[PDB]
Amino acid sequence: GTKNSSGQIVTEGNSWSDYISQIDSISASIILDTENESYERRVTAKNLQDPEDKTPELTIGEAIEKAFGATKKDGLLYFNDIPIDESCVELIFDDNT
Amino acid sequence: GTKNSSGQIVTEGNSWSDYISQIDSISASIILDTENESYERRVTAKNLQ
Amino acid sequence: DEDLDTDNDNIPDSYERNGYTIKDLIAVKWEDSFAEQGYKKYVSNYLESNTAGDPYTDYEKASGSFDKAIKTEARDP
Numbered sequence: 185g186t187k188n189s190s191g192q193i194v195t196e197g198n199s200w201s202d203y204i205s206q207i208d209s210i211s212a213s214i215i216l217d218t219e220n221e222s223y224e225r226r227v228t229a230k231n232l233q234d235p236e237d238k239t240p241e242l243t244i245g246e247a248i249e250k251a252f253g254a255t256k257k258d259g260l261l262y263f264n265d266i267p268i269d270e271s272c273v274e275l276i277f278d279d280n281t
Numbered sequence: 282g283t284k285n286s287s288g289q290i291v292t293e294g295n296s297w298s299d300y301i302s303q304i305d306s307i308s309a310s311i312i313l314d315t316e317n318e319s320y321e322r323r324v325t326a327k328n329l330q
Numbered sequence: 331d332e333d334l335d336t337d338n339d340n341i342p343d344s345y346e347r348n349g350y351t352i353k354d355l356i357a358v359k360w361e362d363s364f365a366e367q368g369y370k371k372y373v374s375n376y377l378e379s380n381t382a383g384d385p386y387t388d389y390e391k392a393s394g395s396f397d398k399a400i401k402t403e404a405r406d407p
Contacts (some may be wrong), residue, residue, distance in 0.1 A: 209399040235368035236353060289385055
């Protein structure tokens with residue numbers, strides 16, 4: 185949904201398909217799973233190879249803190265009174281990453 | 282195919298039928314045949330009348 | 331000395347001579363001490379805009395502001 189000049193929004197001719205692949209070309213995929221729901225986000229990264237690219241980069245802990253709305257409490261990370269660390273969950277990577 | 286002002290070309294609503302007969306009204310037809318292919322061209326002539 | 335015939339938004343001398351380089355969305359002269367920075371060299375055409383029959387022009391193709399899913403070796407014209 186996007187709004188034109190008259191203040192109303194329109195959903196006609198605006199597909200979601202023609203923004204899929206581009207996002208999956210430039211982003212990292214982060215999947216969280218609690219015991220009730222799941223969450224899946226895409227965060228943009230910095231291609232370090234080509235030097236005209238100006239994208240402000242982060243680390244993976246910063247990206248987890250930024251993507252989900254998660255409070256830094258005493259240095260650690262808390263999300264809906266759940267502790268999230270590198271020491272208190274299970275991390276799953278595929279072999280290339 | 283013809284190109285508009287934005288540099289891209291369009292093929293929609295441009296038929297080839299509505300230029301057939303006019304060409305066949307004003308041209309001479311030349312057919313060459315070699316032993317591998319054939320070629321057929323139309324060259325305009327001069328109505329002397 | 332900006333006598334570009336086609337409006338491909340770039341210097342015809344930097345077209346026909348040595349080359350050029352898109353930096354900060356502008357086209358500057360090709361330097362010989364730029365390969366170490368990560369930049370590359372592009373050589374193109376001036377008498378026509380789309381010098382490979384792509385749907386995009388040279389300025390759309392060098393500065394990669396055309397589609398982000400295109401692989402990076404399809405950047406040079």
